Amino acid sequence: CVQIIGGFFTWTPDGIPTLSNITIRIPRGQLTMIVGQVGCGKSSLLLATLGEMQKVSGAVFWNSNLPVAYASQKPWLLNATVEENITFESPFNKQRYKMVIEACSLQPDIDILPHGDQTQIGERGINLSGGQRQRISVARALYQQTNVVFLDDPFSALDVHLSDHLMQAGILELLRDDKRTVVLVTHKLQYLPHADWIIAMKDGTIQREGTLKDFQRSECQLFEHW
C-alpha cells in the first residue's frame, strides 16, 4: 500500500536535502530491513518515512495522509505506570498484555519494580535503563497492534541473549501479524537473512537494495557474514 517515488529528504529545510530521489515501495506484508553505518541517515530515513524531512521532489503514499506504529531511535516514555506506558492510550486486554509482557521480557523488570506494572516510571519515577526503555517502546508498539510497524534498530540497546529474545519474539510477532507489514530497520547483519529485503545506506543515500545474491554482487554479503 505504501508507495514512495523519487523522494528527497533533508535534515534541515534551510539546506539541500541529505537524501535525493529515493524510490522504494513497501507493500503490506513486506519485511524490510534498513541497514548501514551509524549516522548514515537510517534515523533520517525513518523521519523521511514520517514526513519529517524536507521533500525537494517526488511522490509519497503512506495511506496515513488520506482523509501507523513507530519505534524511535531514542526511547520516549510517559511519566506514568509501566502498565500505562504499555497500553499507550488503548483498552486493556490481558492476553495481549500477557503476550507483550512475556515477549518483551518484562516479567523480570516488573519483578524488580516496586509496584509491578503499577510502578511509576519515566520522569520522577523509577529510572529504567535504556534497554528496558527500548523494550518498553517495542512492547508499546506490539500492543498497539497497528497494520504497519517501524522499528529503528531495536536490538542495539539489548544484550545478545535479549537479541535472541527480540529475534524469537519478532518471529512470533510477524506470525502474530495477520498479514501486516512490519518494517525493521537494523544495524545488525545477524538476522538479515531472516527478513525479506535489506536497504543499505551510506552518507545519507541508499547504496543498494536487493537479495543476498544481489548483495554478493554488491560485495557486501560476505562483509555481512563477517
Curated annotation (Swiss-Prot):
Domain ABC transporter: 2-226
Protein name per the record: ATP-binding cassette sub-family C member 8
Family, similarity comment: Belongs to the ABC transporter superfamily. ABCC family. Conjugate transporter (TC 3.A.1.208) subfamily.
Residues of the full protein shown: 678 to 928 of 1582
Role summary: Regulator subunit of pancreatic ATP-sensitive potassium channel (KATP), playing a major role in the regulation of insulin release. In pancreatic cells, it forms KATP channels with KCNJ11; KCNJ11 forms the channel pore while ABCC8 is required for activation and regulation.
Subunit text: Forms an heterooctamer with KCNJ11; four ABCC8/SUR1 molecules interact with one KCNJ11 homotetramer.
Annotated Mg(2+) binding sites: 43, 73
Signal peptide: none
Cell compartments where the protein resides: Cell membrane
Coiled-coil annotated spans: none
Residues that, per the record, bind ATP: 11, 39, 43-44
Source organism: Cricetus cricetus
